[PDB]
Amino acid sequence: KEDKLYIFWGTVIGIVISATIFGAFRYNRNVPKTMNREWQAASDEYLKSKNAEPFTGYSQIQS
Amino acid sequence: MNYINRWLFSTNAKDIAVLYFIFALFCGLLGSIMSLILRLELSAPGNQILMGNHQLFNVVATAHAVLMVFFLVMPAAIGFFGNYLLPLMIGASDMSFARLNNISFWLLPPALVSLLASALIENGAGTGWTVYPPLAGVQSHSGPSVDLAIFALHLTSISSLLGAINFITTTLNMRTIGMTMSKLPLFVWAVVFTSILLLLSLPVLSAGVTLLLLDRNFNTSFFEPAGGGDPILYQHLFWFFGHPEVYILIIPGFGIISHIVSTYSKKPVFGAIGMVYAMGSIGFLGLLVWSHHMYTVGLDVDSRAYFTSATMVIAVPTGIKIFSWLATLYGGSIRYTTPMLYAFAFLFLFTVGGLSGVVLSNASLDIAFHDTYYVIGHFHYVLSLGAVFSLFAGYYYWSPLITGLYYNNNLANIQFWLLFIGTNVTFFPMHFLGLNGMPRRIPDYPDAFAGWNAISSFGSLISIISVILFAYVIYDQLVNGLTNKQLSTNSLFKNPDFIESNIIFNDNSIKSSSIDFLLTSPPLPHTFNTPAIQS
């Protein structure tokens, strides 16, 4: 009974470290000019005038 | 001088397997760091780590393909488990051609040097793993990089051919007194059936690579369409090697799983003759299909219909093996030790990665999936989760017998769960990126493919931590490993039964179906003086 707790709390502290490493490579990114909300709202008007994705959905907004 | 005549000038077959293991560990570390370099660039849109260089992205992908198709999986599955276990299972002292075993080892460190020197003298060799003719000419790659990379696929070919002839010649006339070739264990049959494909596939690859070399440097024009040749010929002469190759990587895994399923579930394997016939059928039907990698090149309409028919037939023998493994695990008692965890995680993920192969077999459906990340997600569920899992299970099964030193159970379980979680996070959104339409071999992508690329960059950092924990497991095995056999009862090879008392069990401890687990555990240098007897 005192070994399954050890395996569980060994896997949790293996997932927490990788999240903190990946977060450090996430603040320091090269963000291009197209990834902004005021640029992905201008693309929706062009995709609305020339009718695109009629059945499902079109939305280029992901902030 | 005794160091030289025993670890450099060697004859013993079991002492080359440990050198194969030490080489395979290094060549599986290098490619994994190269894969971490790729996955840290394919994270968010833009040009992040490699500043603007689209060379040194294709070079990294090529060198990550070669170092783990040719330098990790084959040396582990042929050198460490084939050279060591096959003489002990069939009951022979050593191999039939021992000096050929020594040359088959020592051809590989000169093959590593040329591949590492194919990425420093020039721009590099960014041709992909499949070195296609009209890109790898003297108009895009003009330098000593492709030439030194196709000389690393000759030495490995010579080593594999010389090992396969040794494996076939040994099992024919070097058996014990009472073994016919119908009482052999299943691992010996796996090694035999991969050694026949190694004979029947490698001359075509050697011919195609040599003709590519003659086209590059002696202006011969086999595959140049300004003199009367076709590039498509090379594709034929590549893929006739290519599809036997990907069964060579997976057939030695299967037999290993059988032993674990036969051991920790205390039942014999359901239908062994059906299993060896199924492996024979899989080995034979891997040579009559090669053109399903080429459906978009412009073939006939009556030739696609043959290769859709001959590809879906291979599902029938593999299902026999899967359902026989289920029938073996059905009735018996199951104790969950660290080989059986990897065994249970292989019967589910090989099925998931293999059911995607039926979707790609159709020529009508391959128009939507060719050169797309669906293919990558298909073959990573089978290569990383089918072969590497079998390798880890084989290591955790046979390492106390070979080495004599035990390991901590808890850290091995933490390693297994970290591999499981990180690898299932990494390769599953590749199916979604493939279905939406992301092509292969691109550093930069449109902004719509961003979000899933943020998630598949997170599991790789989980898997590298599992590799580092595996390194610490090996270190804890080597130091203080004599005192790691009373912590847990995983060290016992088989458990006491219901009626079998403990006092009776300590007198008669090992019950087996092979010669392997009754030896003294360091295996002796000369392990059979008098011959073994089978009725």
Add this chain to the structure above:
Amino acid sequence: DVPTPWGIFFQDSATPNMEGIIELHNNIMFYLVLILTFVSYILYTIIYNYSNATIVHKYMNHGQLIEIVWTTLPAVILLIIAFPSFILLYLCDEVISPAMTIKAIGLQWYWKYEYSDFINDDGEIVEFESYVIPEELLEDGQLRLLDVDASVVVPVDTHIRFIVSSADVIHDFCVPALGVKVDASPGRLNQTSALIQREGVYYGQCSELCGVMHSAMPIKIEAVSLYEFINWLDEQ
């Protein structure tokens, strides 16, 4: 059409061939889901019932009826899968009268389009080259690494035959919505056929590796009406 950010499934169709592809994939997924659920239920039963058990049935090792049932039952599934696959392979192609031909030659890192008809007596064939718009010169709202300076403009409800070749290395023409994926190898011509049912814009990317600028080579197809196509062809 355009890719969507958190995509799970296919893009939307504008050609009968892509609808046949979608229908065949959704037919295969039925049997694959059935097989995966059967295997997963058997492992669940094995884990829940026969874990750390006192009784071992160590003599149930032969089987004779049950080995026929896992040999004939997958075969019937393969025949049922193989019927519509062959019908889709043979049936949906250019059986009757293509109405146009556009030659799409692939150079090193751009595309070259020739509309081979509409020939004058002197050889005044309409021709253009399509490049990629760089990130620095984009206007407000254009898609990065997919938007071009010249686009292939075709009518609706007209069979169009694409003949694809190359001049340098092996390329691959792709428009995902239209169901077109054919190679471009430097010494032979290849053909595909497309019929477009609704107006819009259709985007695509090259597939087979060609060198450093593999990620910047888009394909853009506009599907105008017939009057707009005639007015466009009298300007170029």
Add this chain to the structure above:
Amino acid sequence: MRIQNRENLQLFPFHLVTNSPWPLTTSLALMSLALTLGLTMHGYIGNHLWLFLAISLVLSSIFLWVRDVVIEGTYLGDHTIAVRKGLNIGFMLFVLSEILIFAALFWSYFHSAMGPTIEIGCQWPPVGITSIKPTELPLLNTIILLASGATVTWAHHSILYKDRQGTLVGLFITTLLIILFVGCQVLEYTWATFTIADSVFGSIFYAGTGLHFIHMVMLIVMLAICYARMYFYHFTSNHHLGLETTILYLHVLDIIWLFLYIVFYWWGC
């Protein structure tokens, strides 16, 4: 096993090789050959006397293996009935692998002969390339090979009837009946009208009949070491495995030449 003094001799009929250094040296020679051939073909070295040292060291490494193969069989005396069967199975599985290299080269011929491209105006042997007439020197080579296949049967049937002069003469005649093949085929490569670079036709004709040239230098060497080892009394009337491997290697090359003469030299249209 119940013979009286049985402990003093080995209890299983298999050969335990002593420790030898030659696998490492072969690999170190192939390292030098691979890197020098990769480098001299693109600059970076200039002098062409390192490649020749690499080839010479490789060939001396194989010769130094075969010495220790001979001494362990005619002097130490460790070749039982089982080890001979293993060596025969081994050699058969290299002859089979050396056949399948020619299969790929034959399939590289029929993929262009049947269905030629548009750049060559659709025609075998194409316009401007005069082929080699098969009623000249390619007849002489065929009849010399068929005679050499007949003379070694008089050499293997004279070592079984214990006639020494009659094994030496036949091997001598065969050794001079393979040198003439090489001498004729080096004269057919200096009196030709088309090179390795003149078509896909001149590129596959000098790549299927050039591997055969390298494979027939090996018979001259293997027959020299079979004449010289018979002159010095190493061959008995029932234990000779050097002759049996050279006979199986010659006949496969004769059958391969009879398929390099109907497909390459006669069939052109």
Add this chain to the structure above:
Amino acid sequence: EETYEEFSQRYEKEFDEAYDLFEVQRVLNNCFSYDIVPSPAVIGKALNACRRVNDYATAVRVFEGLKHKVETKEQYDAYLEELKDVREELGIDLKEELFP
């Protein structure tokens, strides 16, 4: 291919010829490894076989395996109301009466 009335004769013959504790536990181990449960006559022979070799724990562990082989609880109590004069003559106590 083997029927109930041949199983329940062959295992009686095997139980009436064991000479050591290894053999009694060997025949007892592969008797509980079929689809047929042992008959009340076979188990009555197994306790005399355990009496000849003089072991006590094996005579208790036979009755514990019946609780796992038998499907329900009513059949287990139907086994224990017929193997009662065997128990109270030799002296075997069940596990749930010892509380070990």
Add this chain to the structure above:
Amino acid sequence: SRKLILFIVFLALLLDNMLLTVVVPIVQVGLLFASKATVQLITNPFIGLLTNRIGYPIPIFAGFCIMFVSTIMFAFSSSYAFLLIARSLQGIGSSCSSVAGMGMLASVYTDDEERGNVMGIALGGLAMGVLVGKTAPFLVLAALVLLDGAIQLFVLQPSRVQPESQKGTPLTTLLKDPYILIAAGSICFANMGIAMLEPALPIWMQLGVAFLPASISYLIGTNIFGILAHKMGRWLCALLGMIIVGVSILCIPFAKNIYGLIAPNFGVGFAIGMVDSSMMPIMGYLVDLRHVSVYGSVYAIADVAFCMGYAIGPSAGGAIAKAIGFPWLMTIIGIIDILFAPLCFFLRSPPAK
């Protein structure tokens, strides 16, 4: 299109020799072994007249269905009379399939140079059945290929009865010609020796390794000499083939061991392959030169000459082996095969009409 017909004919010949030869793993024995060949010999000329009436594709799939139901009746048959009936229906199905398939390859491929190559590929199925585990993968591969054939022939385009536009010459008019008979005799006397060698080989002397080199050499011989027979002349290939069959047949009595039979067996099989792929296209050439072009009855005659050896072989071979013995039987068949070879020169240029 045109290649799927080649696939269908290859599978038809494969199933022909698989259901003929492979009966033991999957006097009464002389009559039971030859029950298939004689009923095929009788019902071969009827299908040649039937294909002119009802057309090519229907008898092929009728023969496949008849073969399937006859094999499944043979699967659980115990009495002798029902077993004889079952093998008779197996033979009559296998007689429809091969004749109609070879006629339809003759009909579609009109060019003379392509016909030899395609029939050289198609005749290679006569040795894969001799070579041929679980075999359920291969049966469903065959079922998938015939599903493709049925989809293209009967589903996408409608098919009526549709009798042929021209009326062919009758069977007796073909039998009055000397060239067709003397072409058929080459195949008959070439296959007679390899037909008689099989039952007498357990008498003289494991089993599969003796027959394996002929199956290895046959495919290589037919696939090479289908293409190259156009430039060399087919009569010369027939002459050299009969010569090599005779020499390799006389090579067998001097052999005194099982391992000494490997080298002549190659010299059998390759040679008989060069007999077949040379001479079976040229029959379809002769009707295009002298008669009206209907290819049914001529390939019926060719299948008659092929199956005469397997019909007459074991029953006469056992009697000769009991009477005189193996080496004189091999000597007389070898001298017959060598002596026939001079007169195949007559097919160099037949007179046109």
Add this chain to the structure above:
Amino acid sequence: DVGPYSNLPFKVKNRRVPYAVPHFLFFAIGMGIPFFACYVQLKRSGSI
């Protein structure tokens, strides 16, 4: 001398430098070479 530390090419116990340094340097080189290759080919092509 057959025993549990006899079949390995490296010495583990009774050693001057402790085994942690040769165990760590092996993995350090193995995960440090393909960054050196990228550094060299980045610096040869202008970019930092």
Add this chain to the structure above:
Amino acid sequence: SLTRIQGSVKRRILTDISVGLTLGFGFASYWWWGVHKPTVAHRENYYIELAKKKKAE
């Protein structure tokens, strides 16, 4: 009576195959009648509205 038990595992096998297939067919008949057919219906009703607008014009 209650002291005669002959077959127990075979009934378990026949139940565990006849539930793993009903569950499989249940989890596959939601993919074809709740995910697939309404998408084809939506696709068709989009196309029986684009033609009527062009007919009006």
